[PDB]
Design a protein around this ligand. Structure first.
Ligand SMILES: Nc1nc2c(ncn2[C@@H]2O[C@H](COP(=O)(O)OP(=O)(O)OP(O)(O)=S)[C@@H](O)[C@H]2O)c(=O)[nH]1
Ligand SMILES: CC(=O)/N=c1/[nH]c(C)c(-c2ccc(Cl)c(S(=O)(=O)NCCO)c2)s1
Ligand SMILES: CC(=O)/N=c1/[nH]c(C)c(-c2ccc(Cl)c(S(=O)(=O)NCCO)c2)s1
Ligand SMILES: CC(=O)/N=c1/[nH]c(C)c(-c2ccc(Cl)c(S(=O)(=O)NCCO)c2)s1
Lengths: 470, 173, 41, 470, 32, 470, 41, 32
């Protein structure tokens, strides 16, 4: 009864549940945990839905059958939940098929809303320039307002809601590529519960149309004021990037890892900073991303400003003796240390200033997580970055190294939670990041679990000095 | 000696349908029941005359296995023709022909000549795809259609000769 | 000992999968430079 | 094309087909042979139905799926065929289930006829004596005539037919055991084709009832003359033992082996004699046997006669200077040599005079094939048997040894055909005869394929001398 | 699973390895 | 005690011994047989020395250690035996080494005699033409007479002997190749036992020197008459081809197979004809062959005669109504049928008239057994051959097919003895003929053990008709 | 060599399966004579 | 099946063998 003692203790959290579900080959354990899933908070389990569903698909029938009833139970009480299940099941098989059809057995408004959004993006392939694309996008988006409001929502939203309106004039396409992604803004009315309310009534509509580079809150103002629905307290504005021809499953995996490391760093008390950005997988081909607002690429910050990074900091925040600057510097240093650790641990490659965003407060944010782990340049610390930190002898730079060590010390103590996420996703995966046989082995080595702190200090120094050589 | 034309053609389909044997039949008139998985790509060649012109065909046997589908798509580049093959006696293989054509409207010229091929016509009694249903689907999607047996050699020459001919008069002007 | 047998088997397939990839990477280079080499005579 | 050359040659027979089906792991071969089954004569394939169905059940899906369409094809053109499939599928699984139900998807008359026969046998368990049992049997059988004639038949019959009448007064139970088997006689009307004809019309009926020990043809006379239907040229009489609580699968396997050895001995030209008796498996628990008529156990021949075996020969055929005797002696010698070989090759155990029958012409017939092969006394040559042969210096006894050698020489040349039968049956078998790990290996060694004839002569001598020691 | 199925699994893996080695040696000889 | 019964019976022959030695994993069996080797005739065991030694090298220590003492025992009573052991042990390893050195622990005269012969052959590489080579060979051979007679012999000889003299003027080199083989004739004095006699005395020596194409017995006359030692009754003449840079292990394997098939065909009573030619392996690189005398290649028979094969037969034997011709025709037919069978069973490739010899009596003899079994054209029946047989409707041609069938029927009955030879040699072999994974499986299929005679007749027809198409 | 490794493994499980049967045959005899021996205390 | 599944099948068979040997030794000690 020593094992059952554990499972009945407070120790028992969704993580432990999933670990034993994954590792125990005892069918009685599997079934016991399958039953205890019901006992957890929805929010906590939600985070691991991809794992559960991956296991269902690629593992023993025993394992699948233990998980199913809980999933069915969730699916019955939330169509949002049903949707994500259906989307994920489909995406993670190219066993799955029979259940997807059973969940989809209603959701047509949403599925057709998404199909249309997908369809739009695919058409833009014939227009070779950004500007031409944006024009067709803007025109074609306007047609979708003709079907709103309806029983439709954005799964990437923090809350329950109904979508009412698309400010098409504000939408923009991001590059000149063959299957270019495009960004849109969407208007919604908040709910307390979606499943039991409304579908609110259409308001037929009638400057707010003009689009230019401005902060997020100034853009909310402009769109709100022009909007039929903008007066309501119920009203909120969302944003998504739509990727019609790009796989997002790596991107989803990265999200979970970032989110876990974030919680790890909050729980221990290391003030590193990172930004997980929400992912919605729609097919093996397609999905969406919630972008960070008030942020633009380092590369284009230097092409529109024509300045050095520091000079831009100084222009946009003030002299280094001002609060605004010292706070931004700190956010820079804390976001850099964070993302260094992530890049090292995940072996993030293809790192350049097109893939690094800078936000309004001075945090950086890395973004293109193609090329990670086993997949076949690395994280770099250019002297332009070191300059913003105040230089090699700077206090804040010493502190950057201090943070790196601290955050590594923290990670090591919660290693299992991180590895779990990746190890379960690898299961029936054909993804480039798992091309190796030793993906997980290499990942564990990178935690250096044998080391003393003094040893880690040295590793941090090596890492930093490595980041500067080029 | 001299050809007037060199046509690059690919063989695609689900693994096990008979691509390597269609090719071995067509190029050296040989067949085998025992089979050796096609790894990545295999190359074979033969010349014919259509409308008085010596045309050398270059055939690329791609492999139906997914393991290799990242590097097969490299060969879709500028191929003038594609023989899309399914096994008459295994229904699933007919079902996947839809994903196999999307595979061309992502990695290959969008103006390529395609022939649908039902192979293993010798297996009469195990037929899982009726000739009529297939030929219906064939021209609903603007594809030419034929049934072959690499084993007894029925229609193998014909199949190639059709698609090469078809190609030879798309190219002009 | 079974742990050693399992480790021997895991190691043999790791090598095989590596070797197949090593080979495909060589083959792609030939395919993009001199495919004439690959003729079946 | 060298293999395909073979398969397109005349060489290609059902055996070779099955061999390659069993051994080749090439799916293209499996499929090619699956297609070529259609090309064979029904009769030849019929003999191997248990193998095919065993393979279907216990082997790769590939293998099953290659066989199925042919089976379906046969099932559609003969309900007899369907029946045996359904019965065997059920019996060889305790995959199978889904197809059985699809074949049974009509046959109710036959299935209920058999269920009732089975049910009868199970009731007799409560009656502790032979005589009491026989009385209940006779009464309870009479009730079944109330349902005849119908769409019902005896699969053990050499021909197509309809069952019309059961001469219940003639039926008898065989022993005092808990799940005793019982013998019945059945009246039938021959068909040219069952599937497309009749169900003939009832004839309501009206000495023929009395039962005593008499020859088969004298018993046909009596029953025929008493029968409503007896006048017809269409009319024939059959017989089956019904085993309600005994497994017959070993018994079925033995049958095939006997039947093969018989053909081997006909094909080579060795005049050994044996009698395969037909088997119908109905469940893992139950089945039927076609008994040899004009034959009774050696043991009871000695208890009702009170004579020595030879003395019985002499009484029943004549003096050893008569034809009838010399012919019977020859049948004795030829049937003994045959059955010795079978006992040795199959390692038949539990051999006593309760398990050996003697027929009207002097052939012996061994019967209880529980305890064979790996299953955990052997074939014996008592001096009472040697006496009937004319003694150790007899010509006929020398000839007995001559036959044994000749029949062994023959067996060796066709070894594959025999081994094939057993080896395929072993597949997902839990039967006592396959308890070992080396059943097939031991079987092969017993053919002594390395030996020269002179070596086999010696082995025969050892064997014989072994059979006499006790 | 039965020993017959285990043996069959191992034989199939070996056949593939040996095939693949030969496939490779045939490519290498051409390059040579 | 049933197994031990077998081993103590007359059945027990070297073959069975080796089979069980190879197959049983029971150490008590291995040891029991290791002991019983001593019990066999030397001659019978000799034939299998390569197998034993191969097993010793590549198998379980258990197996090696069971064999060793017998080998040691033989090695002590015959230096010839020791030699072959030492040579084979070395050749079959590129475990072995420790024992080779222990056997070589005397034999220097022989080893140096062979080293010199080897050394000679290697020097001829620098002379680009046959004639130049032959001239250097002749000169260099003369020097070896300066070291004769000595404790030296030719292991390829049918008897015990001492080598006395080399008629160097008669030696010839066979081709213009880089590592050309060369043929020599050697003079010897017969012994009753080598190990305990002589080394005879030198006779210093003094037309017999001239070399031309003549029969073997006419060449023995010429050399004998010129020889110091030629007068003695003790005197005999031998011949060997010396291959300094060619591997002979395939060639040795083929020899055993031929020799076995020969005995098989003698034992059954099929008058097929073949000629195994003796092989001596000296290293993995080098060895010797006993050539057939009064025989020359088909190809050169047609280039020196300028005739058709038949026309040559008619010139050299007489008209087809003469005895000499009818006898030669028969030998042709019997040697063809033989060699066809061998070519088919061994899958002999690279078949052309440079590889087929014709002897003085009309037998053909195939020779270059590179390219056999799994190794990556086949045996052909040209119409020129069919003509010599008297044509398609000829009696002798029908009889050729009759022989093929008969010899195949015979082979099938002794299959194990053939397969054993090959299967054991495959063990730690890197030889091209074992490149496949299915060498032995393919070999067994080629016996067609399932077939009836009628089936084999058809296979023979297919085979023949195949041999004519080209 | 993999054939020798496979043969070693097949031999080890043959022995184990034999030994289990040897044991079950002993156990059945106890079960039918004196099952008290088999009490869980 | 994957090598991980094969390894897991073999580990499971050994665990049973080792258990069964201990079960037996516990019976034998009682008889002793
Ligand atoms: N009966 C029949 N069998 C065929 C025919 N074509 C191929 N096969 C069989 O199908 C099997 C697989 O064929 P194969 O040559 O591997 O096709 P493939 O498409 O190249 O398979 P892969 O290379 O992607 S592994 C082989 O056993 C072959 O003998 C046909 O026309 N008729
Ligand atoms: C202004 C702005 O860039 N907002 C964004 N916020 C986020 C999370 C953005 C983002 C994040 C990840 C990716 Cl993968 C993309 S992307 O549109 O698909 N860019 C591809 C190569 O850049 C865009 S973009
Ligand atoms: C008169 C007579 O005995 N006829 C028979 N013919 C045959 C084949 C008989 C037979 C054959 C096999 C078996 Cl297994 C049986 S049986 O009824 O089941 N006897 C069990 C132990 O004897 C009976 S009995
Ligand atoms: C006159 C004559 O040719 N006598 C010979 N007898 C024999 C057995 C010869 C022979 C047999 C086999 C081989 Cl392998 C050779 S050989 O010298 O090595 N020829 C190589 C290609 O022919 C020669 S040659």
């Amino acid at each position: 009864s020593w094992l059952l003692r554990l499972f009945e203790s407070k120790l028992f959290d969704i993580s432990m549940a999933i670990s034993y579900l994954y590792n125990s080959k005892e069918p009685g354990v599997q079934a016991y945990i399958g039953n205890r899933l019901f006992c957890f908070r929805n929010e906590d389990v939600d985070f691991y839905l991809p794992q559960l569903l991956n296991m269902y698909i690629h593992m023993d029938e025993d394992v699948g059958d233990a998980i199913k009833p809980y999933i069915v139970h969730r699916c019955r009480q939330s169509i949002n939940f049903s949707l994500q299940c259906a989307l994920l099941l489909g995406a993670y098989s190219s066993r799955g098929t029979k259940l997807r059809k059973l969940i989809l057995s209603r959701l047509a408004p949403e599925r057709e809303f998404i199909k249309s959004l997908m369809a739009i993006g695919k058409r833009l392939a014939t227009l070779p320039t950004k500007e031409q694309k944006t024009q067709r996008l803007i025109s074609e988006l306007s047609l979708l307002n003709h079907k709103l409001p309806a029983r439709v929502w954005l799964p990437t939203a923090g809350f329950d809601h109904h979508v009412v309106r698309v400010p098409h004039t504000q939408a923009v396409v991001l590059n000149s590529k063959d299957k270019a992604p495009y960004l849109i803004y969407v208007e919604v009315l908040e709910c307390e519960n979606f499943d039991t309310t409304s579908v609110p009534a259409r308001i037929p509509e009638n400057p707010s149309a003009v689009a230019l580079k401005e902060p997020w809150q100034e853009k909310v103002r402009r769109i709100r004021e022009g909007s039929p629905y903008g007066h309501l307290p119920n009203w909120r504005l969302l944003s998504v990037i739509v990727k019609c021809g790009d796989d997002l499953r790596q991107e989803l995996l990265a999200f979970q890892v970032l989110k876990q490391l974030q919680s790890i760093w909050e729980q221990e008390r290391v003030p590193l900073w990172i930004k997980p950005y929400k992912i919605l997988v729609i097919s093996a081909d397609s999905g969406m991303i919630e972008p960070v607002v008030n942020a633009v690429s380092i590369h284009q910050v230097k092409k529109q400003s024509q300045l050095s990074l520091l000079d831009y900091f100084l222009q946009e925040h003030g002299s280094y003796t001002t609060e605004a600057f010292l706070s931004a510097q700190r956010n820079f240093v804390q976001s850099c240390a964070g993302y260094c650790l992530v890049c090292y641990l995940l072996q993030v490659k293809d790192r350049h200033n097109g893939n690094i965003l800078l936000d309004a407060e001075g945090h950086i944010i890395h973004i293109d997580f193609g090329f990670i782990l086993s997949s076949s340049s690395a994280f770099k610390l250019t002297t332009e970055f070191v300059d913003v930190m105040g230089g090699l002898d700077g206090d804040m730079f010493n502190y950057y190294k201090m943070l790196m060590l601290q955050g590594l010390i923290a990670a090591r103590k919660h290693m299992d939670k991180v590895v779990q996420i990746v190890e379960i996703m690898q299961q029936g995966s054909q993804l480039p990041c798992f091309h190796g046989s030793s993906t997980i082995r290499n990942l564990k080595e990178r935690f250096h679990m044998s080391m003393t702190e003094e040893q880690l200090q040295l590793l941090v120094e090596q890492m930093v000095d490595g980041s500067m050589r080029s | 000696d001299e050809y007037d034309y060199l046509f690059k053609v690919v063989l695609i389909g689900d693994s096990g349908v008979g691509k390597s044997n269609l090719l071995s039949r067509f190029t050296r008139n040989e067949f085998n029941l025992e089979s050796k998985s096609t790894i990545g790509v295999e190359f074979a060649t033969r010349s014919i005359q259509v409308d008085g012109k010596t045309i050398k065909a270059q055939i690329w046997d791609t492999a139906g296995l997914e393991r290799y589908r990242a590097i097969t798509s490299a060969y879709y580049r500028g191929a003038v023709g594609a023989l899309l093959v399914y096994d008459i006696a295994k229904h699933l293989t007919y079902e996947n022909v839809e994903r196999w054509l999307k595979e061309l409207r992502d990695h290959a010229d969008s103006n390529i000549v395609i022939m649908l091929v039902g192979n293993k016509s010798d297996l009469r009694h195990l037929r899982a795809v009726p000739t009529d249903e297939a030929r219906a689907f064939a021209e609903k999607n603007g594809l030419s259609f034929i049934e072959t047996s690499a084993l007894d050699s029925t229609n193998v020459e014909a199949a190639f000769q059709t698609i090469l001919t078809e190609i030879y008069r798309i190219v002009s002007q | 000992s079974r742990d050693e047998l399992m480790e021997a088997i895991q190691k043999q397939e790791e090598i095989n999968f590596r070797l197949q990839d090593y080979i495909d990477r060589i083959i792609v280079a030939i395919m993009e430079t001199n495919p004439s080499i690959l003729e079946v005579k």
